[PDB]
Amino acid sequence: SGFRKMAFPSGKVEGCMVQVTCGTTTLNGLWLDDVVYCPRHVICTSEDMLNPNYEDLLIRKSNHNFLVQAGNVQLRVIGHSMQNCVLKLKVDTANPKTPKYKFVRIQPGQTFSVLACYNGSPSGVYQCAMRPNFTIKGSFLNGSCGSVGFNIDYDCVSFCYMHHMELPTGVHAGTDLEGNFYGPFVDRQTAQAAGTDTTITVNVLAWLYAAVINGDRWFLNRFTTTLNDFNLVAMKYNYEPLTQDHVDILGPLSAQTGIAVLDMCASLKELLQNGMNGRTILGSALLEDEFTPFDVVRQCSGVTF
Amino acid sequence: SGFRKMAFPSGKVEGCMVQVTCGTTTLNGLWLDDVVYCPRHVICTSEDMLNPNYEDLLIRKSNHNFLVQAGNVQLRVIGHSMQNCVLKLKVDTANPKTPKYKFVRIQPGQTFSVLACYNGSPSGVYQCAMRPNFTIKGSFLNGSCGSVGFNIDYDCVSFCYMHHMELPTGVHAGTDLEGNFYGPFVDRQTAQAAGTDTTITVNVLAWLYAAVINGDRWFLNRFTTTLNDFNLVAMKYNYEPLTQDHVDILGPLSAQTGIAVLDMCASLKELLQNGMNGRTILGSALLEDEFTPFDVVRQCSG
Numbered sequence: 001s002g003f004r005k006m007a008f009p010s011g012k013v014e015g016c017m018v019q020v021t022c023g024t025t026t027l028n029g030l031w032l033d034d035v036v037y038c039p040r041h042v043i044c045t046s047e048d049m050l051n052p053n054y055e056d057l058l059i060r061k062s063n064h065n066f067l068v069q070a071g072n073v074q075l076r077v078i079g080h081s082m083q084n085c086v087l088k089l090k091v092d093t094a095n096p097k098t099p100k101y102k103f104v105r106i107q108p109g110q111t112f113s114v115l116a117c118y119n120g121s122p123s124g125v126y127q128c129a130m131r132p133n134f135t136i137k138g139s140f141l142n143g144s145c146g147s148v149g150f151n152i153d154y155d156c157v158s159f160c161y162m163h164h165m166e167l168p169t170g171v172h173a174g175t176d177l178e179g180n181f182y183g184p185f186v187d188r189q190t191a192q193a194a195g196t197d198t199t200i201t202v203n204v205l206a207w208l209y210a211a212v213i214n215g216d217r218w219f220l221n222r223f224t225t226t227l228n229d230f231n232l233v234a235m236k237y238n239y240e241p242l243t244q245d246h247v248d249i250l251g252p253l254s255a256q257t258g259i260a261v262l263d264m265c266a267s268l269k270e271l272l273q274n275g276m277n278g279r280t281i282l283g284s285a286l287l288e289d290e291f292t293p294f295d296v297v298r299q300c301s302g303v304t305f
Numbered sequence: 306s307g308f309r310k311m312a313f314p315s316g317k318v319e320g321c322m323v324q325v326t327c328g329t330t331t332l333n334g335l336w337l338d339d340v341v342y343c344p345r346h347v348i349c350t351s352e353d354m355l356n357p358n359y360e361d362l363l364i365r366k367s368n369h370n371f372l373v374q375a376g377n378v379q380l381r382v383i384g385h386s387m388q389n390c391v392l393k394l395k396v397d398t399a400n401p402k403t404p405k406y407k408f409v410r411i412q413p414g415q416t417f418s419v420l421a422c423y424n425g426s427p428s429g430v431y432q433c434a435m436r437p438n439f440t441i442k443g444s445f446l447n448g449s450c451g452s453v454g455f456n457i458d459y460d461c462v463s464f465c466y467m468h469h470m471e472l473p474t475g476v477h478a479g480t481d482l483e484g485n486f487y488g489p490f491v492d493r494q495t496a497q498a499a500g501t502d503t504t505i506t507v508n509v510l511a512w513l514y515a516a517v518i519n520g521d522r523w524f525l526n527r528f529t530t531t532l533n534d535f536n537l538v539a540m541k542y543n544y545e546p547l548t549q550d551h552v553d554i555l556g557p558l559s560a561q562t563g564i565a566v567l568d569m570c571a572s573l574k575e576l577l578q579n580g581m582n583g584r585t586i587l588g589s590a591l592l593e594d595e596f597t598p599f600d601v602v603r604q605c606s607g
């Protein structure tokens with residue numbers, strides 16, 4: 001028992017992390033087979049950052065202007081290319097630690113593990129959700145860009161995130177590995193509005209189910225609710241509307257614990273209205289929204305890879 | 306910026322995780338050089354758990370009763386030994402993924418990452434803390450025993466924890482890698498309760514400094530207090546007493562923020578007395594106590 005914020009094992013990803021330096025800027029890159037993927041803003045100066053034409057800047061760079069280090073070994077850049085907001089540096093050696101992988105674009109609501117790295121050296125691993133406003137609430141200093149987020153699903157590392165920028169509030173924006181940003185964001189040093197965040201209801205419910213699984217059940221009540229009744233209450237706390245799709249997704253967890261979704265919804269309704277009255281759920285005084293129903297089932301059933 | 310509960314990269318440890326089977330019980334072993342470390346109750350069934358005689362159970366075992374499995378490779382056991390509550394199986398191969406490592410006994414208040422494992426296979430990593438009552442709030446299912454807690458410093462993995470058991474309330478007890486339990490617990494199904502926990506004051510202070518570095522300062526007040534005076538309050542709300550040691554160790558954070566520990570203590574005194582009063586700190590409605598000063602410095606420097 002017990003329930004933690006739990007990242008995926010990071011080893012498969014650590015072995016892919018390299019340092020990419022261009023002029024003054026050193027950040028992180030992702031070395032898969034004979035390609036190093038990194039944020040294209042590696043090529044910018046201070047000036048260029050305010051308003052980069054990446055085309056001009058790229059044409060003015062040589063293979064020689066990229067310094068790539070995998071630990072204590074310097075790689076050779078034999079080619080370079082830009083796909084949206086990512087730079088692909090072709091090198092003359094394959095990453096011998098390259099895991100089976102895919103590139104996926106994830107949806108808001110979905111979670112993933114971030115491997116924070118500095119100088120191509122992994123420093124930490126933690127779990128984030130893609131917020132409804134396409135940001136993540138991460139932990140990212142100068143030097144972190146190129147840090148990736150991933151999931152492991154069976155025989156496969158699924159890279160979904162590459163870190164680019166910080167936004168107001170100290171939330172973060174990045175791209176998929178095809179170099180398309182999540183959300184309306186653009187890789188330049190401009191004033192840029194996050195857009196309004198909301199609580200991921202489905203995830204809150206999942207977390208409640210995790211609460212029950214792990215013996216923490218004081219918030220359970222004998223009431224139930226209609227989906228509309230529940231959603232009426234939800235809007236007023238800036239919760240995502242719960243949809244039948246969401247109801248259905250909590251299927252397994254509902255069956256697992258014997259508690260209909262709309263029975264849990266009625267618990268959630270009481271929590272929103274009366275609050276917690278001094279109490280905790282799973283060691284937390286607010287309602288947690290960064291566990292997917294999948295995440296709960298994975299942790300509570302010990303699914304490994 | 307931003308601040309997140311964060312574990313060490315887990316890969317250095319993932320290369321050491323193996324599966325160990327003795328009859329019916331499977332759990333996790335730690336493969337370092339030519340030795341596999343695992344909890345000694347691997348040699349138990351359930352009709353032993355109530356009062357096991359470990360020396361006898363072990364004497365009736367031989368090298369070949371231990372099946373050790375590194376993914377696909379069965380590793381042959383050529384030697385077995387018992388050190389307190391851990392088993393040391395010598396095997397014919399040295400682990401080529403063995404990192405630089407130490408074995409250390411941590412103190413309550415110190416944090417570490419757990420790599421939860423089942424069937425010799427990493428499942429997940431998370432950060433916890435040795436509580437003052439000598440438990441940790443982990444996430445362990447049946448199969449998780451042998452999972453280890455560690456800290457990484459440079460290239461060197463300091464192994465501090467091995468998982469043995471769940472106590473009621475759903476907190477966990479284990480050993481150091483020399484097989485000694487943290488706290489008064491024993492590897493025997495029996496009359497064992499954690500005992501009430503305290504909040505790690507030094508770590509709460511560390512975390513409030515984190516909130517300041519991240520531009521969250523609503524809770525700062527103009528006042529500073531004394532040690533004695535803070536502690537009288539601490540006792541009342543079940544916080545570890547704060548020592549000059551703790552004051553010293555908060556030194557780098559106090560310097561970096563310009564806020565003196567005892568100034569910060571006054572803010573904490575105010576939070577303890579008044580509550581957080583509808584507001585949050587680093588996205589939390591309660592005072593977080595599982596970040597050490599080192600953790601904060603680490604995460605807020607590089």
Ligand SMILES: *[C@](O)(C(=O)NC)[C@H](C[C@@H]1CCNC1=O)NC(=O)[C@H](CC1CC1)n1cc(F)cc(NC(=O)OC(C)(C)C)c1=O
Pocket residue numbers: 025026027041049140141142143144145146164165166167168169170172186187188189190191192306
């Ligand atoms: C990244 O390029 C890096 O680590 N490079 C060495 C860098 C990481 C940032 C810095 C602090 N936290 C992070 O996540 N990314 C940037 O610095 C980006 C680059 C832009 C093309 C996308 N970036 C550059 C800036 F000049 C400013 C900002 N953000 C910023 O000023 O934040 C406000 C104050 C909220 C606007 C930024 O993200």
Ligand SMILES: *[C@](O)(C(=O)NC)[C@H](C[C@@H]1CCNC1=O)NC(=O)[C@H](CC1CC1)n1cc(F)cc(NC(=O)OC(C)(C)C)c1=O
Pocket residue numbers: 001330331332346354445446447448449450469470471472473474475477491492493494
């Ligand atoms: C571990 O042996 C394992 O994973 N084996 C395959 C096991 C880990 C447990 C199982 C659920 N979550 C965990 O943390 N540990 C045990 O089962 C231990 C055995 C060690 C003392 C030798 N253990 C044995 C018991 F008989 C009972 C208990 N705990 C227990 O029943 O939990 C209470 C009721 C909350 C105290 C126990 O942990």
